[PDB]
Amino acid sequence: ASPFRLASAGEISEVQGILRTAGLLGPEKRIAYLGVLDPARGAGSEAEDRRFRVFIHDVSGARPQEVTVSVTNGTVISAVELDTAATGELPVLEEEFEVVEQLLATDERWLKALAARNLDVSKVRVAPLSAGVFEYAEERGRRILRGLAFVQDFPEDSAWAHPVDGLVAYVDVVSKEVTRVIDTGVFPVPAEHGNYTDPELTGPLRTTQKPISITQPEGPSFTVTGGNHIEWEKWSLDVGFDVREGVVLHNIAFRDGDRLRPIINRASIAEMVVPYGDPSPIRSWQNYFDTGEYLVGQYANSLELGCDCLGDITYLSPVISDAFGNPREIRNGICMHEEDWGILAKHSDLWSGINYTRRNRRMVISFFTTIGNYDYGFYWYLYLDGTIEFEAKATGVVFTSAFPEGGSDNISQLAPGLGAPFHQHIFSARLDMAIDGFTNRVEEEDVVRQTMGPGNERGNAFSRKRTVLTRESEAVREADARTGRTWIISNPESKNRLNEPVGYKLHAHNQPTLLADPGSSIARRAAFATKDLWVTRYADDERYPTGDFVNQHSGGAGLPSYIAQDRDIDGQDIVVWHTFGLTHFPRVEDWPIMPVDTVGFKLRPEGFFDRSPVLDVPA
């Protein structure tokens, strides 16, 4: 059967053919998003119905459509015309990458700005930047990109070293019109190159690094069946891939003795946003929803053995649609491997004389994406002891500006005249929970300090408290690192051998959440990012914390809308949405290419098992 299998080339071609046959994919049409939908709750007991969801753009100016197709049955389930002024523009198209530059290169206003700075238009790269929603009334219902310029001295030059500050332009990418060109004044274009492969800058390459060789002479300890079903050290799951979210994990479960015990039904990064903290009008509008606006899966890198993924690696090569509905594979886009993870457990007992040491390991499922200047690695880990973890690795080249004469409270200096505006990278992990099945609840757990006094005469006692989140109205929670705050997802109907509800505990990093003023456009569009933890009642159309159409879309959709339904979440099918991010004040060490920095979260079993689940691990 495998209803959770990866989309195949054939299914994508078949979706193309069904849309063509239905008159929904003529020559003016482009696919902005296409993805398989998950099986309905209660299916499987039913025969397969592989359904695909598609967002269709029209290059002639007609309204776009949202369409669901049954590839199994050869039918259109639903097709609806979108009013983008109301519900949002479609994601940025790959084919739009060059359009902002191209339109600007023959615009008199743009040419005058470049001439004022003695810049050859043929050398000026313009990034295709999402526009957001600000004060420009003509943009409402128009497909707009904003353009920031970077000089490329020659084909292999890193243009990020040479930002053109004081200049921004706005462009209607459908009508092919430049709507505005703003020039607030010339800034020096920083002169130093940032070519990290140029020997003049790297100096002589190190010869001190002796090889490290990681092999598995008997092959890996996991199996892959049905294309994407993994079995490893009692874990079971399906590795999905979506052009928006990237790698998605389905049906995470753990085989405890004879019983396959569900833990998480679906795990994904459902949004990620990069808000900038520079109040210059040149960049004060910039907030990049890498997931919702750009689609991180579509820009997943092909990962090279040795370089990207080291050891004995099993790759998946997910298939996506191009703009015309033809299938296109991302060769070696997903890495899967197990790695040693140091000591699992150890004790040398004085009274028994028994010395005991065991090694840990983890299964790693990862991909790496590139969104303009940024490159991110998304890593999911499963450990022997039942721990589940996510880690993002952020690297690439920092987004640059001029560094103002006399400094800046909102920009860092990286090189002479070269700045890097402050920003955050903020993720939302959507964890559709299934702790021992779907009947789940969430408690907030704080450490409780106790006063010295009767019953605690020495003032040493400390405790904890748990507060059940009973309805969605009560389920928008903030971190409290000082009181060791965590959140436990339990099954109130499933008890361990000590008669306590089985559970998993989410441990957050307690990094700063969204810093923008609460009255800002970004605080509304990225409302999710203002709070660390949200809990909703599962619904099949509540997929993204920002809604389906983020591009140039105001508040009105996403998590705040979902939570208003105030649904019962106390022993129901629920979804946890955890916000976590990095706050980046760039350092000189980040330039000219950034060393990886990290953020994430993990969930650990909390009386899920009846004792340590790793007593059967051999020496």
x-or-dash pattern for Na ion, window 425-444, by CB under 5 A? -------xx-----------
556 binds its own copies (CB under 8 A): no
Torsion of CA 285, 287, 293, 299, to 10 degrees: 130
Residue 57 vs 537, nearer CB to Na ion: 537
Cβ neighbourhood burial of 142 (10 Å; 0-12, 13-18, 19+): buried
Minimum Å gap between C-beta 321 and its own copies is 20
Residue 202 interacts, among Na ion, Cu ion, its own copies, none and using kind-specific CB cut-offs from 5 to 8 Å, with its own copies
616 binds its own copies (CB under 8 A): yes
Tally of CB atoms within 10 A around 471: 15
Minimum Å gap between C-beta 399 and Cu ion is 8
* CB-based contact 269:600 (threshold 8 Å): no
Minimum Å gap between C-beta 456 and its own copies is 5
Which part of the chain contacts Cu ion (CB under 5 A), choosing from 228-236, 239-247, 565-573, 584-592?
Answer: 584-592
Known binding-site positions for substrate = 288-299, 371-376
Our answer to whether residue 276 is catalytic in this structure is no
Residue 584 interacts, among its own copies, Na ion, Cu ion, none and using kind-specific CB cut-offs from 5 to 8 Å, with Cu ion
Member of 338, 436, 443, 548 binding its own copies (CB under 8 A) = 338
Tally of CB atoms within 10 A around 454: 6
Contacts of 322 (CB under 8 A, 6+ apart): 31, 328
604 binds Cu ion (CB under 5 A): no
Give the number of residues in contact with Na ion, rule: CB under 5 A. Answer: 5
Contacts of 531 (CB under 8 A, 6+ apart): 476, 477, 478, 513, 579
Contacts of 397 (CB under 8 A, 6+ apart): 158, 160, 194, 373, 592, 593, 594
Minimum Å gap between C-beta 593 and its own copies is 5
274 binds its own copies (CB under 8 A): no
Residue 218 interacts, among its own copies, Cu ion, Na ion, none and using kind-specific CB cut-offs from 5 to 8 Å, with its own copies
Choosing from 157, 278, 290, 385, which is the catalytic residue? 290
**Rounded Cα–Cα distance for residues 3 and 9 (Å):** 16
Residue 1 vs 350, nearer CB to its own copies: 350
Binding to its own copies in span 457-486, by CB under 8 A: 457-464, 479, 481-484
> Nearest Cα to 310, choosing from 214, 209, 211, 210?
214
**Rounded Cα–Cα distance for residues 132 and 88 (Å):** 10
532 binds Na ion (CB under 5 A): no
Torsional sign, CA 149, 154, 159, 163: negative
x-or-dash pattern for its own copies, window 566-605, by CB under 8 A? -----------------x-x-xxxxxxxxxx-------xx
Binding to its own copies in span 369-408, by CB under 8 A: 370, 372-373, 375, 377, 385-386, 393, 395-397
Task: Provide the CB-side half-sphere exposure for 155 (13 A, CA).
Answer: 0
Our answer to whether residue 385 is catalytic in this structure is no
- Cis amide bond preceding 91, omega within 30: no
Residue 45 vs 460, nearer CB to its own copies: 460
469 binds Na ion (CB under 5 A): no
Binding to Na ion in span 569-598, by CB under 5 A: 573-574
Minimum Å gap between C-beta 459 and its own copies is 3
> Nearest Cα to 428, choosing from 187, 570, 599, 299?
599
Residue 471 vs 524, nearer CB to its own copies: 524
584 binds Cu ion (CB under 5 A): yes
Binding to its own copies in span 246-265, by CB under 8 A: 257
Residue 385 interacts, among Cu ion, Na ion, its own copies, none and using kind-specific CB cut-offs from 5 to 8 Å, with its own copies
123 binds its own copies (CB under 8 A): no
120 binds its own copies (CB under 8 A): no
Known binding-site positions = 288-299, 371-376, 423, 425, 584
Question: Residue for token digits 């979804």?
Answer: 575
**Rounded Cα–Cα distance for residues 563 and 328 (Å):** 38
Question: Residue for token digits 């190190």?
Answer: 206
Give the number of residues in contact with its own copies, rule: CB under 8 A. Answer: 152
Residue 603, beta-bridge partner list: 388, 506
38 binds Na ion (CB under 5 A): no
Q: What is the DSSP letter of 95?
A: G
Member of 16, 130, 410, 530 binding its own copies (CB under 8 A) = 410
333 binds its own copies (CB under 8 A): no
Residue 23 vs 203, nearer CB to its own copies: 203
Between the alpha carbon of residue 131 and those of residues 193, 365, 469, 537, the distances in Å are 29, 33, 37, 32
Residue 288, beta-bridge partner list: 274
Please tell me whether residue 269 adopts helix, strand or coil conformation.
strand
Residue 314 interacts, among Cu ion, Na ion, its own copies, none and using kind-specific CB cut-offs from 5 to 8 Å, with none
| Run of H or E including 48 | none
Which part of the chain contacts its own copies (CB under 8 A), choosing from 60-68, 69-77, 104-112, 149-157?
Answer: 149-157
51 binds Cu ion (CB under 5 A): no
Please tell me whether residue 481 adopts helix, strand or coil conformation.
helix
Member of 33, 52, 55, 368 binding its own copies (CB under 8 A) = 368
Known binding-site positions for Cu cation = 423, 425, 584
Between the alpha carbon of residue 245 and those of residues 32, 300, 472, the distances in Å are 14, 11, 24
- Strand-pair category, 501-508 with 594-605: antiparallel
* CB-based contact 130:143 (threshold 8 Å): no
Q: Interface with Na ion by CB under 5 A: which residues?
A: 432-433, 538, 573-574
Active-site residue numbers? 290, 374
